[PDB]
Amino acid sequence: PAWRNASIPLFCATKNRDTWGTIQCLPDNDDYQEIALNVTEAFDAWNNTVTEQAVEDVWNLFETSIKPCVKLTPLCVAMNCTRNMTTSTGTTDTQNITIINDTSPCVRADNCTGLKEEEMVDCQFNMTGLERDKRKQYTEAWYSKDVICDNNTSSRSKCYMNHCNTSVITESCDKHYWDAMRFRYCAPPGFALLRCNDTNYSGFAPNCSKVVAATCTRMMETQSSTWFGFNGTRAENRTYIYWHGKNNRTIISLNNFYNLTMHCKRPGNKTVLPIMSGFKFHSKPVINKKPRQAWCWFKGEWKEAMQEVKETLAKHPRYKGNRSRTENIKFKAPGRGSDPEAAYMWTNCRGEFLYCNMTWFLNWVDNRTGQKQRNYAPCHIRQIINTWHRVGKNVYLPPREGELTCNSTVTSIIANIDTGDQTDITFSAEVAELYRLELGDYKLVEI
């Protein structure tokens, strides 16, 4: 038959039965039927209405599931800020390798050497809150990497936040988080969904020789992550890279053979037994001294997956670099003064967002001699969390007390590929590239 393009959003069929899943989505009955077609069609992983609908639904789920306490819109507001310097002196750098697992004594007491305590900033500002005509004062904490001050010599001076998202909208916030949710995009009757099923799909395809028709989409994951991708569904038994046709924005998937799993854990209050002390049988509890830091533990064959990523990049048809040399290609983080997502990690662990140092993981993966090679990343929880889809900003509650564990499987890597004298692959903060990897071969057509 003959089909034309459409931009009407579909209806979603989910398996979880939360509030947002019941309100905005239908139940899913696993009625996934695929019909193979011997037709040639054009598929775009970026210029598709299904991708934008999926990203909009994921952003709606993020806004509705975990509600911010403060919602912020772009407006520069003059304010007076003081600088509380949290100064901790570091010791001599030890270059010995320490493959630290979950059975180490430093992680359980939560007194193990991690990231620095960043200098928190207190600011006072008078704006209209819920009432549009009455100015109200608020005092909330901000970090040192998201502030810009006119006079750096004085402790108190007129300063601005980064991006000027400084308009506080209050909201009664409760610590809610969404679990491992899955859904699919079922087409309405009178409409069909086409899936590009070729093995050589690289995001762009003007000619798709393997088009498979279906009434619903495949399995999905809504775990937000920068620099990585967790619990993905399109993790095949191969490594494949996607390249946008106009810029350097890319998305790189991984392989299931190496079993790249993800474990992020933050200890809270450790107590040997509920407090029952006395003359005898009294014991101390392990109190927390740095509750604002966390830990994420990388497991699996990371270096062989990296080598397969290098081989897939060198075997890409549009790659302009040296095919015969693979040691020139290296993974580099963006420099200092960049985004917090472009400086550390950003992943969700039951409502908690963790910002982890890539530098030790970069030294371990890329086997850089003379530097600290650690198979993990020391994390630090940010109370100030950036947004990725729309221009906004949110402030959350202080974290809970206890252990909030998470288990995931690393399936994809968000990165930007640049080709030159030295092939520098930097990492991007585009969370939408995960879903553009997941359903970029899907495209709605109108019967």
Next chain:
Amino acid sequence: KKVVLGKKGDTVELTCTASQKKSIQFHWKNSNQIKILGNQGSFLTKGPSKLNDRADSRRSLWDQGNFPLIIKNLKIEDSDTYICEVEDQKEEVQLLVFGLTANSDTHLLQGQSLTLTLESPPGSSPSVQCRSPRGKNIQGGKTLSVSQLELQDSGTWTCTVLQNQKKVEFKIDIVV
């Protein structure tokens, strides 16, 4: 295009024009195609340039449709053209920084000669038109020397430079 003048140390504003009201991704590029400031969604990615700690912006008008470029501590070598990249369009902005200073701080006796040192960027043709409280509007080239300087010729002289129909004021400290 429009050209502005810097006062050798203060801040200058290089506004952009946009009517989309979407807060789209914008780029700041110089004449050598070197990244300085940019947008990544709702972010700023500071490119590998020499204005990492000097380039800033008033970001209240992101939703209004104007993207300024605020550069502090302006120098002679920082004068370069910049282009704004919104909606696949290039809006060239020209920036020129100059200054004027002397070599004698306070030892200016009566009847002594006056020395000036005009600091100008290369590729420019300034025209010094100083104004005096006594009505002495001396006009000449770039380097100006006055053979007369007395107690009655003190004060802050208003020396300006006419270049492409643009002129700004300065202050000269004379102590006798």
